[PDB]
Write a protein that binds this ligand. Sequence first.
Ligand code: 3UK
Length: 394
Amino acid sequence: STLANLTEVLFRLDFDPDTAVYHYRGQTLSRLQCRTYILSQASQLARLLKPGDRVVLALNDSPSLACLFLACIAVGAIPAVINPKSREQALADIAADCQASLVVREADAPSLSGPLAPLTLRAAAGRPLLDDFSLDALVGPADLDWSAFHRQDPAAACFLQYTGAPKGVMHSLRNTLGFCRAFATELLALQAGDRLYSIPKMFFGYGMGNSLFFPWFSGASALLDDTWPSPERVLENLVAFRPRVLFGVPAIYASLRPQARELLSSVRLAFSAGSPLPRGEFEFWAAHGLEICDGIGATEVGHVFLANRPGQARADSTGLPLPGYECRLVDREGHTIEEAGRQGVLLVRGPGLSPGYWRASEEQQARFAGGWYRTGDLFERDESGAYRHCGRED
Ligand SMILES: Nc1ccccc1C(=O)OP(=O)(O)OC[C@H]1O[C@@H](n2cnc3c(N)ncnc32)[C@H](O)[C@@H]1O
C-alpha cells in the first residue's frame, strides 16, 4: 500500500474550495480558509512534535479545535480529543496512557504535572475564529507554503479516541475513510453544501465523525458550538443556522418536542445514536412529518455500523448493517445464532473497525479477537434481518 496522510487525503477530495466547511459564532470558514490555516499551523507543530508524538486536545468544539486536530495529523502526530471539563486526574490518566507530548487546553487551565507530564498550551481568551494556541510566541510565525505531510502506512494509527482505567482506541487512515464512506456516503448520501448540526461534541466519537470529518469528506458544512447544549442553546442554533441534517440522541429529541415546528422548518434528515430510540419518540416526530433514524455506533468501530436507512426507518429497531459491515449474534457458548427472535451478543466486522487499543492488556485487546469487535450488547434479529437492542451481556 502507498504511504499516505489522512489530512492530505481529505484536502485532495474534489469539492469546491470556496464552499463552507465550518460555522462558528455566526461566522463561516471555507474549505480553502481552513486548509490554508491547517498548513500554516502544521508548519509550527512540526517545530515542536516529531512524527508519532501524541497530543491531547481538551477543548470545546470550535473550528480551531478541528483544524488543530488535522494539523497534528498533517505532521504525523497522533491527537485525541477529550472533554474540556474533565477532572484533572482524568486528564492526567489519559495523557499518561498515551504518553502525550503535548496537551492543549482552555484559557486559564492549570498545567499538567507528575511523571513525564506533557507540555501544556492554552487557547486564547475571547474565543477567536482561528486560534494559534500560543504557537506564534512559542515557535515563531508560520511558514507560508508548507506541505511537508508525514506519510505512513494507511493501516497505522493516526489518531486516538478515548470513550475503568482509560482505553485509547486507535484509528487509522484506512478505517477512518471506511467509516466515513459507509455512513456519510452509503447510508446518509450527504450532498455538497448540506448544513450539518451535531449536538454531541467532538470528544465523543459520534460527534467527531459528524462535525470534524463529514464536512471534509462529503463537501458539507457543520455548525460548531463551544457552549454546552442546553435546549435553549440548541433552539438558538436551530433558528440561526437552519441545518438540513441533525445528529442527536433520544433524550435530545424528547427535549425538542415543544419546538417541533421550528425543527421541521429546516431539518430533513434526523439521526439518533447513543442508546435505543423509543417508539414513543419515533412516533411523536413521525406525526409532525419527521423520520428519526436510529443507528448504533461504537468507538471501536469508528462510527455507525448498523442503522435504519433514511426513508425506510421503523420504530423500536436499530435497522440493518451498513454496506461493508457484517454483524453476527452469538449465544452464551459462542455459537452463531441463525434464528430470528433469539437474543445474543452482537459482534461486528467491517470498514470502520479499529486495529486495536493503543495501550492495553491482552484481555482488553481480546474484545478485538478474530477480526471482530465484541460490542457487549445483546441484540435480536427479526425475519427481515433488522436488529433490535435487548440490553448488555453480563
Ligand atoms: N462512538 C460512536 C460513534 C457513532 C455513534 C455512536 C457511538 C457511541 O455510542 O460510541 P461509544 O463507544 O461511546 O458507545 C457504544 C455503545 O453505546 C451503545 N449504543 C450506541 N448507539 C446505540 C443505539 N443506537 N442503540 C443502542 N445502543 C447504542 C451500545 O451499548 C454501544 O456498545
